[PDB]
Amino acid sequence: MNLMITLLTNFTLATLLVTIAFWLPPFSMKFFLVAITFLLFDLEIALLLPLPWASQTTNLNTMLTMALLLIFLLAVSLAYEWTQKGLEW
Amino acid sequence: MFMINVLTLIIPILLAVAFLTLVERKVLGYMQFRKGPNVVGPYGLLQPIADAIKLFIKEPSSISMFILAPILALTLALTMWIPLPMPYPLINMNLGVLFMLAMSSLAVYSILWSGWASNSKYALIGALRAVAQTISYEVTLAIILLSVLLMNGSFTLSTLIITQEQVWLIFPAWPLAMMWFISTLAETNRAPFDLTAGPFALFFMAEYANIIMMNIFTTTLFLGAFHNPYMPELYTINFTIKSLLLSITFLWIRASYPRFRYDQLMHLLWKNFLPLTLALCMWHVSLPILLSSIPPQT
Amino acid sequence: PGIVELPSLEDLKVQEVKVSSSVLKAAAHHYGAQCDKPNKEFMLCRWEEKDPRRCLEEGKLVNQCALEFFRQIKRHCAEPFTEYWTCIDYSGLQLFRRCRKEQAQFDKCVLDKL
Amino acid sequence: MMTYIVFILSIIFVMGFVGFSSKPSPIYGGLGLIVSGGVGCGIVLNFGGSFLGLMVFLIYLGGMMVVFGYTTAMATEQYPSNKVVLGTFITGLLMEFLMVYYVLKDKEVEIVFKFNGMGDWVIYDTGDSGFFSEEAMGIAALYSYGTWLVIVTGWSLLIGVVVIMEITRGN
Amino acid sequence: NVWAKEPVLVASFAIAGLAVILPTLSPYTKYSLMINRATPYNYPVPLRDDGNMPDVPSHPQDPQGPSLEWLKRL
Amino acid sequence: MWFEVLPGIAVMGVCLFIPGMATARIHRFSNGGREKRVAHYSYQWYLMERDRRVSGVNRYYVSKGLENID
Amino acid sequence: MSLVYMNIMMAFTVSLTGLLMYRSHLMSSLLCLEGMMLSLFILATLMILNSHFTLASMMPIILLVFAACEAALGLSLLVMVSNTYGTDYVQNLNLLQC
Amino acid sequence: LLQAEKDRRVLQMLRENLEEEATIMKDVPGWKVGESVFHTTRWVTPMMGELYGLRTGEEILSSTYGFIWYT
Amino acid sequence: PFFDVQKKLGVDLDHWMTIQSAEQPHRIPARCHAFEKEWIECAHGIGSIRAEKECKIEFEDFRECLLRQKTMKRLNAIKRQRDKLIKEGKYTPPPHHSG
Amino acid sequence: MNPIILIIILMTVMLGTIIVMISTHWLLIWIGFEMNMLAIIPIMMKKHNPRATEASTKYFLTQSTASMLLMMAIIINLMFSGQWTVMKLFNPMASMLMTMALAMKLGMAPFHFWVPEVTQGIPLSSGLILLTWQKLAPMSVLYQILPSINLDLILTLSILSITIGGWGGLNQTQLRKIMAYSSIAHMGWMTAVLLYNPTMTLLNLIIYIIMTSTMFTLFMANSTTTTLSLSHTWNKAPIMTILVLITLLSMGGLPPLSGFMPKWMIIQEMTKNDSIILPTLMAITALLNLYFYMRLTYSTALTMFPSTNNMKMKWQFPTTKRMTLLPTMTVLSTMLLPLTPILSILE
């Protein structure tokens, strides 16, 4: 409710500013690769990111190996589109 | 005293942004051979207060969506200084760095809403390109954030200010710091990373509050000072001075270099940063498991 | 179908060691050192038979052992333990690197007199 | 300003879901789903919730509706709304408000269940000593245990990349 | 040569290759695993004492049990 | 030269300086010179709840040290 | 019974009907499918929170990344549809008859 | 010691809440006075409603919702 | 086809994602841990039909553990009786703060 | 469309189906259905006509809503008695929506509206791989969670599916829609005998996939879509026609030929249960869906249509394709009559 009070105060101040302002007077296919490419790398980011919360376990070799396989798989995908004229124009 | 905490947070943002505008105008003028503004007003503070009240005066989409874009940009600019650990942070959030990143993504939302709101023009197609060059850097910035907190246990950021006070984090990773700096250049959307309409003052306000947010977060992340307790004023003065110097350096780089080509921008990003980011991040994974120093999350 | 039986306040009228947790954290190693040998009776009782309303008299036992330890630290050495917890009190969440000098003085106290 | 705050946030969550499931123009639908995801993330953080709901918020309201607005903007314009959307929204509000009445001032309404009528501050854990904030270590699995799962997930992501580029004219 | 053709990529391959290989030789792998294993998160329960095992002291000050000392010995 | 701009830069820095100092003063005022007990976990929260329980005021800050034994 | 689950299931059913009945554009139906995805996410997440099923908490994040790449394939198909026609209509599909 | 105090306190709340139920339901049909819902007589962890019922807002919001949106 | 790679090649890739009583990373239970262990040991060497004939006691115990359906039913009956007799208006309550 | 990339995608089809087979966890089964969808989409649109675009769009929407309804059923299952085993479930509602999702998956008369559409405007290799693998996928699921299903669901699906495949099918002119309607009818058959003995279901799956492989291999041997080109392939090649004769009559399921054996054994272990009018009504429908088979065989091999020349010009040139394995699979698919106690292969 602390964040709710801050959100309320900032929203009401924003509405006061906007009411003071306004009450006192064809595409490319090559565009489409960027968004889905971004989103799939953001998905692999979502796979990578629980690592620093995890790094205190006993099975550390398994953690290190699957972390290597995750970054290496992201590298394989990036090198795939790199060699196969993906992010070109 | 919670609403008074809210007042002490969100009252000085207006004076901070307007004085940042006079500072960047004067420092651009001294990077050039231009004294001024110093005629009307002592050292030109009346000049930004007259800029604000004048741009409020000089005023003549789908009125719903036309309001929904800058209201989102301005409420993000307001609500995103909360977990900042100027010595005692406002809300001790358990995790705030991904909160920073998600609200940067909401800023990208507000930019896309205004881009649709610019009423069916080659202007809006250029605005979609601006959305593309804005969104093309939250991958790299998040992965660099993951590496630089990988030596820091968890997102809690007070444990970060514990880890920073021995030695600065610039020495464990200076090129990763420079790459994150370039990513902040690309995300703050000024020179050399350009470009592209009302209310101009409120959008102006939102972008500069975004830049101050990133500046304070940058000065937080990669440096610090010895924090003597029961006197926060020492760390507050020293952190404020170094945030001033970092923001001056950021405008100082905004001044003097030509812009990029769009395909040069994308080609540069992917095929120069992104394998280098991956190699630095797998090295940041493989390092503490081999040096027997993993950070103790509580 | 099955009703239960719950014990009365006949055994739940017991005074507690109602100090703050900051000074109790300041007395962590020492209270774990001399006392807290027969509280593992209560711990073993609870982790074997998972019943509260079973091992409560050993709860009285650990309560009076903590009361014994607190009277012993109150009467005997020393007074600047008060200084020690009011030193470590306002440090947000407590660490042990925070108030080290008075910790060393309290060490010298407890080593020289007990 | 009362106790049933999870219930009221669930009500506004269903309000937003109706507000875009009445089939508007799709960018207004994306606006409604952004508001719905915001209040749903508020729901899961109000169960606490301190880790996971804000964690995957970057992927859903950090990754999805941006790309939806992207592919909606570069597809067409839909410059004309219709009475059918307003009628469906009124019928959805009718169903919502009728469930509100027959739950709040009554006992239960059962599709095939028995919904006990009260705001659920209970059930809830009895302050048990986690000290590691169970969500944290929970999602911080997959690295001492999760061998197979990350392998097949990265396999599907790699195949998703090559599938997208092939269908969008590989190479 | 092969270097300045695509230089940042070759540099990335070099630093990534040493990041792969460097776990195969290190004087701190087993030290890392022992330091990580030697941190009690879960609470140690006691038990019914033993049938006279050559371990498990009564007071934990008594060094009869298997304990750590290299935490202080660098 | 820069002699004319550094007072304005200093005023902008004071506007950057002021919310941390004001917030820290309200922090130290809100607990009688003490800091807020920064509870992050369930264990810290139960510790803080027994702290506000044993103080009698239903307010954690008093902390009633060692004078409750006999 | 945790009364919030009733309205989240009602929200699921509303999102399901918004998936199935749709008149003008495929983007609306696919967005209702994304909202249904969000519904299943939130429902299973609150189950795992209030149940303290702490061991296999993989479900919400893995559900969302997989159905995310599903949605990415759907956007690829919609872009292909908008390319090989002028629009993205529910109509203009009577060819390849039944 | 915190474990022991917690167990004594929740048993005290259970004894007081059985006193509450012995006061209030003196006229209802059915209702054995101390029904556990289950079958096997083992100790079950309470659900915070048996610990804090009929409190009306204050202490339940402090003991449940305080950690969720405080600090 | 239920192939026996899981029981043949020995790699228990999914014999830990399944239910609890497996070793958590920090060893904690959930709300119904003993009920899980008892129900599973009731239905181990059982062909799933006399599980329904015989283990119904522990099955219903486990379900009322997992939902607290009749528990919240009884609690709401308590609340409705409290509401109607405080509408009646008797004994300004010393369950709270007093006696 | 590099052959390395297509071998990769075939490997993903295999991997998704095997994850559907072996995983005892529900999430991985959902992941397998998704990955098989994601792999089978670029198999289609091997060309770039809008026909394959619309076909893959329709199939994407159907498979997507099937996957989402399955995830719904799993989440409801853990709202009730919650365990991640593929076992006898504990909800009529969850098993109800789960069988409805599998009916979306493999096609039933409620859910068959996409099948002739998606099978018309695609190449035949894509139709082969989608029919074989997407009907092999739910059989493991039903084979493992049979003991907690209300039988009226699957029974109504089966009756209505076989009679829709009987009625729809007597009017069409495309071979792809003919094979699609036959797939509808036989999947109704192979789902109908679930809750009594899954041995018949799995063995009928074996026989039907062998039949469809032989049929689509024959239609790979001549790039034909209508009966007209089938008569032209009569006028250029005779042995293809006797193959069409024998294989189509085995799809008819006639007792000297091997296709009657999955019918007859189903009738046996369905009528050792003392319901009789339902199996004989289903067998009347199995009589009913033989007419289009028979008129197809008439227009191919037994009647002779006139033809246009340049097939004289074709006569100098061989039918020089390579087949995957046509003749071995054909004589396995047709001469398999005395191998009735090979039913015992399963347990």
Numbering used by the authors:
A (entry chain D3): 1 to 25, 50 to 113
B (entry chain D1): 1 to 60, 66 to 201, 217 to 318
C (entry chain A8): 1 to 114
D (entry chain D6): 1 to 80, 85 to 175
E (entry chain A3): 10 to 83
F (entry chain A1): 1 to 70
G (entry chain 4L): 1 to 98
H (entry chain AM): 73 to 143
Paper text:
The ETC is composed of four large membrane protein complexes: (1) a H+-pumping NADH-coenzyme Q (CoQ; ubiquinone) oxidoreductase (complex [C]I), (2) a succinate-CoQ oxidoreductase (CII), (3) an obligatorily dimeric H+-pumping CoQH2 (reduced CoQ; ubiquinol)-cytochrome c (cyt c) oxidoreductase (CIII2; cytochrome bc1 complex), and (4) a H+-pumping cyt c oxidase (CIV) responsible for O2 reduction. CI is an ∼1 MDa membrane protein complex with 45 protein subunits arranged into two “arms”: a peripheral arm that extends into the mitochondrial matrix and a membrane arm that is embedded in the IMM (Hirst, 2013, Sazanov, 2015). Here, we report the isolation of functional SC I+III2 from ovine heart mitochondria.
In all other classes of SC I+III2, these loops were disordered, suggesting that they are distinct forms of the open state (or deactive form) of CI (Blaza et al., 2018, Fiedorczuk et al., 2016). We identified striking changes in TMH3 of ND6 between the open- and closed-state structures. Whereas in the closed state, ND6 TMH3 was a clear α-helix (residues Leu52–Met74), in each of the open states, the helix was interrupted by a π-bulge midway across the membrane (residues Tyr60–Met65). The ordered ND3 TMH1-TMH2 loop in the closed state crosses directly above ND6 TMH3. This loop, however, was disordered in the open states. Additional large conformational changes were seen in this area: the short three-stranded β sheet of NDUFS2 that harbors the β1-β2 loop was adjacent to ND6 TMH3 in the closed state but rotated away from TMH3 by as much as 10 Å in the open states. Surprisingly, the CIII2 MT-CYB that is in close contact with CI showed lower overall resolution in the SC class containing closed CI than in those with open CI.
